[PDB]
Design a protein around this motif. Sequence first.
Motif, short mmCIF file in Angstrom:
data_model
loop_
_atom_site.label_atom_id
_atom_site.label_comp_id
_atom_site.label_asym_id
_atom_site.label_seq_id
_atom_site.Cartn_x
_atom_site.Cartn_y
_atom_site.Cartn_z
N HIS A 39 -28.77 -22.47 12.88
CA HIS A 39 -29.47 -22.90 11.53
C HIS A 39 -30.92 -22.66 11.56
CE1 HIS A 39 -31.12 -26.05 9.21
NE2 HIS A 39 -30.23 -25.76 8.38
N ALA A 40 -31.53 -22.89 12.69
CA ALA A 40 -33.03 -22.65 12.50
C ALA A 40 -33.37 -21.31 12.22
CB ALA A 40 -33.61 -23.11 13.65
N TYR A 41 -32.84 -20.45 13.02
CA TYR A 41 -32.84 -18.98 12.67
C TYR A 41 -32.87 -18.59 11.20
CZ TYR A 41 -32.80 -13.73 13.04
OH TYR A 41 -32.91 -12.41 12.89
N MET A 42 -31.74 -19.06 10.32
CA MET A 42 -31.59 -18.48 9.02
C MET A 42 -32.68 -19.17 8.02
SD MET A 42 -27.40 -19.41 9.38
CE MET A 42 -27.14 -18.91 7.59
N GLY A 43 -33.50 -19.92 8.41
CA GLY A 43 -34.41 -20.55 7.35
C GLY A 43 -35.40 -19.37 6.98
N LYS A 44 -35.48 -18.17 7.54
CA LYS A 44 -36.20 -17.29 6.91
C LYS A 44 -35.40 -16.27 6.01
CE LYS A 44 -36.40 -14.68 11.32
NZ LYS A 44 -35.85 -15.73 11.84
N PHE A 45 -34.08 -16.25 5.86
CA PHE A 45 -33.30 -15.42 5.20
C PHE A 45 -32.59 -16.32 4.13
CE2 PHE A 45 -33.51 -13.68 9.70
CZ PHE A 45 -34.35 -12.51 9.33
N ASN A 46 -33.04 -17.41 3.60
CA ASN A 46 -32.62 -18.11 2.66
C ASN A 46 -32.40 -17.27 1.46
OD1 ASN A 46 -32.33 -20.12 4.45
ND2 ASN A 46 -34.17 -21.09 3.96
N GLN A 47 -31.00 -17.20 0.44
CA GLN A 47 -30.93 -16.77 -0.45
C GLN A 47 -31.05 -17.96 -1.74
OE1 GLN A 47 -31.16 -13.50 -0.19
NE2 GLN A 47 -30.74 -13.77 1.98
N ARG A 48 -30.75 -17.35 -2.94
CA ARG A 48 -30.89 -18.35 -4.21
C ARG A 48 -29.77 -18.04 -5.01
NH1 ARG A 48 -33.88 -13.99 -4.62
NH2 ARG A 48 -34.07 -13.29 -6.88
N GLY A 49 -28.79 -17.14 -4.85
CA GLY A 49 -27.63 -16.79 -5.64
C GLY A 49 -26.75 -15.66 -4.98
N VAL A 50 -25.63 -15.57 -5.71
CA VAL A 50 -24.45 -14.80 -5.26
C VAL A 50 -25.00 -13.19 -5.44
CG1 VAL A 50 -22.20 -14.11 -5.58
CG2 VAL A 50 -22.57 -16.47 -5.69
N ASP A 51 -25.45 -13.10 -6.96
CA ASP A 51 -25.80 -11.70 -7.06
C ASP A 51 -26.88 -11.22 -6.05
OD1 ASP A 51 -27.62 -13.53 -8.01
OD2 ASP A 51 -27.56 -12.50 -10.09
N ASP A 52 -28.07 -12.10 -5.91
CA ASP A 52 -29.15 -11.62 -4.94
C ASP A 52 -28.93 -11.23 -3.72
OD1 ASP A 52 -31.04 -12.17 -7.27
OD2 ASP A 52 -30.61 -14.45 -6.74
N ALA A 53 -28.05 -11.96 -2.95
CA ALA A 53 -27.56 -11.69 -1.64
C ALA A 53 -27.05 -10.42 -1.76
CB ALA A 53 -26.55 -12.60 -1.17
N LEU A 54 -25.76 -10.01 -2.60
CA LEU A 54 -25.09 -8.75 -2.79
C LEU A 54 -26.18 -7.69 -2.94
CD1 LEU A 54 -22.15 -9.99 -4.98
CD2 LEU A 54 -22.24 -9.96 -2.58
N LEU A 55 -27.15 -7.77 -3.75
CA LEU A 55 -27.93 -6.71 -3.99
C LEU A 55 -28.98 -6.36 -2.85
CD1 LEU A 55 -29.06 -7.13 -7.61
CD2 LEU A 55 -26.96 -5.86 -6.55
N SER A 56 -29.28 -7.43 -2.26
CA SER A 56 -30.44 -7.42 -1.09
C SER A 56 -29.42 -6.78 -0.12
CB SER A 56 -30.77 -8.80 -0.53
OG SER A 56 -31.67 -9.24 -1.44
#
Lengths: 270, 221, 40, 46
Positions: free
Chosen positions: A171-188
Amino acid sequence: LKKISKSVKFTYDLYLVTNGKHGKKINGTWNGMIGEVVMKRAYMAVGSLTINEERSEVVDFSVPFIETGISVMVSRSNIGKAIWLLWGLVFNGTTSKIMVSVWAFFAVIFLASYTANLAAFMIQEEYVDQVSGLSDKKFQRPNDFSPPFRFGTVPNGSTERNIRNNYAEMHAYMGKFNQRGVDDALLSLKTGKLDAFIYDAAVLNYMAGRDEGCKLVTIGSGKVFASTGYGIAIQKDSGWKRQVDLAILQLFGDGEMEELEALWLTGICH
Amino acid sequence: WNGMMGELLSGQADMIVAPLTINNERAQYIEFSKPFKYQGLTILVKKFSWGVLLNFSARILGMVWAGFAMIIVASYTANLAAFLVLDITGINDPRLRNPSDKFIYATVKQSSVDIYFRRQVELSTMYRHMEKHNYESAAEAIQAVRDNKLHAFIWDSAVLEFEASQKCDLVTTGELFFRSGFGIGMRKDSPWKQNVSLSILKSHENGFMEDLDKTWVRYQE
Amino acid sequence: FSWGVLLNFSARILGMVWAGFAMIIVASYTANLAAFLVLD
Amino acid sequence: GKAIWLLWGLVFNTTSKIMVSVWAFFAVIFLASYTANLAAFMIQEV
Ligand SMILES: *[C@@H]1O[C@H](CO)[C@@H](O[C@@H]2O[C@H](CO)[C@@H](O)[C@H](O)[C@H]2NC(C)=O)[C@H](O)[C@H]1NC(C)=O
């Protein structure tokens, strides 16, 4: 919901939540759809609500109508001459001539079957996933390999809560890869800025079958961790909960979900 | 009533723990908790001339016949490749819509699947065919179809998958319909409900279900 | 001779090894061109 | 006069050597393209 109000005969009106997304007990205070039902400003919350032990103590969840879970999506990666004489026939006296000809006949059957079978081999070519699952070495040891890996999820959600309560370091590792939306994750993910995205299983299945092409896929042939259900939030100890759920069971027995899910949850990619 | 519900309502039982098929009749008479299983329904099925013919006026005929032999062997290669390459599917089988004495599909007598198929009168002919070959237990049907005395068997997915793992000849179909679950039958409203459902959910949330699958479900034979 | 072999006593040993290599290479090229032209 | 007989036989299996090699490779893809037509005619089907 249209099917629901029909048989129990209750009137209603909708409105959109303004504070929060799905519910987060901050300083002992819940927000979002759940937060209002605790405050009883609304009597029912309908949407994408994940059933878990923590949320089942402040409200009541009716029987789930669709099964989901937690999944991860990644982008699909794109005498000396006697032997000599007999050796050339396979690579395309009177009794000596007879032995050569019959050997050539065997060679032709050998080579002809070799190419025909080889043709069928490339017909059934397949691919495999790069990660076994949530307990992968690259996952339990993220950025601990020659190639640094990257993966994250949207904060303030049920999936984020589950990770913190079972794998603290992960959980601590993912703190710097937090997204904000479905589309943003798909495009990134498409741009390569991200390697893996973890989110709800039900919706990521929808995006996989409706993405531009079939570049994005889920791990395995569909793997679900911590199976649960989607539920309808009701005010605590309501008198409707007996009648609310009994209608849902009528739906599965008759079979209306099959048509409804084909209307909304069908996909293109296979 | 009879069976598990017949015993539970008689008071001789207290709490049914079994692969209980959740339906609408049971929810009216007795209570449930969160289902611990996720699966649907499917079908179980069983599965110098010597150097030329092989490789001056006669020489023209010889080269023409060599070309003839080459085209003949090319044609034989083409036809053998065609020979070696080219030469039910769920409830939607028309031969099962109007069955006969050949395609034998059966189900368990006095089981929830028979009631489920009787509910939809659109499969009345199927209800009129399964009535002649209902078997008491799944073991009887599996044994009979292993003897190839049966041709189809409408049954749960997980059980038939474990059976196919056990017996390699056992094969399932494609359609996955009526996605229900298995849960824990109970008595009427009792304090043995809230904590029971909370415990079931707490077992589903962590890796306990995966461990139980490692014990019995995940393993293959 | 070598220019006549690749297209058609370790010397001839390597020659026949390379002949087998050429045969498998041309078989692979035939397979890939056939797959590229027939199916897709 | 004997070049025609030798050249055509090599279709089916300094200046002279170079010319035949191009012709043989031309025949190589020719019969290779012929097997494709065999595959094409296979897909074809009163
Ligand atoms: C999760 O919730 C927190 C708190 O609401 C969000 O953090 C806020 O973000 C907004 C927009 O940047 C700021 O204006 C607030 O001041 C922030 N508050 C705090 C206390 O952090 C956070 O953005 C939410 N998750 C997301 C979408 O990143």
